[PDB]
């Protein structure tokens, strides 16, 4: 029941700062150091620093000293990572992780931080309508910036057979992705299928019902 749950995705211009939260639950918080490590897109893992909630002492890697600040808020049992003077090279997924006797035994889900001067744009969401076998349906999430978007189905009740594809960067500089699921065709007229799309940078939240296209004239 150790959990670490991080805040949602961020996007900031070069020169700005960001502050990411890591909510801890389910253990004696003062007894374990919490670490931060980041991962640029298709890259490896880079250690940033750590904080002891017992006394709020910190230690940073040299390359982040003076730019990263870790704090511990005991009443909300939350660690915060703030980093200033952001650079393109700071685009990365930022993780918090609990250490136990130096080993990183529990990791948060990661927070994507994008450093960009491009304009934020929320997506449009369009149905991919299904056409004794299997049927495919989905949602098209078109024309957004920056990453990421999340797509769940039936508010998380439907997970089997879901495929949410990597976003493609269009020539417009905006992303588009599709999320599909395969279901029994016999469920089509009876079971309701809804894709829940979230694009935190633009505060876009869309729930789209996806039904067979009516051939009624």
């Amino acid at each position: 029941q150790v959990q670490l749950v991080q805040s949602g995705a961020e996007v900031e211009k070069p020169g700005a700062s960001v502050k990411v939260s890591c909510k801890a639950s389910g253990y004696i918080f003062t007894k374990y150091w919490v670490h931060w490590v980041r991962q640029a897109p298709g890259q490896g893992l880079e250690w940033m620093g750590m904080i002891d909630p017992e006394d709020s002492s910190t230690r940073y890697a040299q390359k982040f000293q003076g730019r990263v600040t870790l704090t511990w808020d005991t009443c909300s049992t939350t660690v915060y990572m703030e980093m200033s003077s952001l650079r393109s090279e700071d685009t990365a997924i930022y993780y918090c992780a609990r250490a136990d006797r130096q080993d990183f035994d529990h990791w948060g889900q990661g927070t994507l931080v994008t450093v960009s001067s491009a304009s934020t744009k929320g997506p449009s969401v369009f149905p991919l309508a299904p056409s004794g076998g299997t049927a495919a349906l989905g949602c098209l999430v078109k024309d957004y910036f920056p990453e990421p978007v999340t797509v769940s189905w039936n508010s998380g009740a439907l997970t089997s057979g879901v495929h949410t594809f990597p976003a493609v960067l269009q020539s417009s500089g905006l992303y588009s992705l599709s999320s599909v699921v395969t279901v029994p065709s016999s469920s089509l007229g009876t079971q309701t299928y809804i894709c829940n799309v979230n694009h935190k940078p633009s505060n876009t939240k869309v729930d789209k019902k996806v039904e067979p296209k009516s051939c009624d004239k």
Binding site: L45, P127, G138, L140, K142
Partner: protein, 219 residues
Amino acid sequence: DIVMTQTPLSSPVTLGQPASISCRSSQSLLHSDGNTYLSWLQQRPGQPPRLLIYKVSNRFSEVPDRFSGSGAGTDFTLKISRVEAEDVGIYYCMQGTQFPRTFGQGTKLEIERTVAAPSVFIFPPSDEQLKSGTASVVCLLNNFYPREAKVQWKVDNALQSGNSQESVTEQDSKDSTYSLSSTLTLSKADYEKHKVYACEVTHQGLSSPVTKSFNRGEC
């Protein structure tokens, strides 16, 4: 700063077959306190890393005994006795003997399984999107193996070029297949001067290329 170096795997691993991943440090990871702080983490696609092995050879709670770790000093090995579908991902070693904490560059484990033909589905643009002046046509290739696959769009049997983009998922952690989506983008204008929209798929599990198609404005 201690540098950790991993060795890449030279080929995918067949389901059921053993795998070994190696990691070396630029100096000994033996701490003065007597511990050797070498751990192994696995990162499955889209997920955070998860701890598998700590202090060279100890299995973290709930890690199956098919995983084991060995080594000493500067040379370490993670071993999977029989690789399972859920083992796909990237494996990282990390040292915790000195600050800064440092990681190896990762070793990618891909799964080799039997050929699987894709199920193919074509989706017309929605009416809502057409109102906006653009038509996206989507072709879905579902659960296939191996990854190599060719998708060719045809409009009134004319081969399309330069107006589609595709995306492929990471290898599935349950059946070790891939899925692929291809999007053909036309203006409402260009879309509405043609009738037959086809997606033709070539892949090793298809005896001959498979085409899925629709006619604009038909049931």
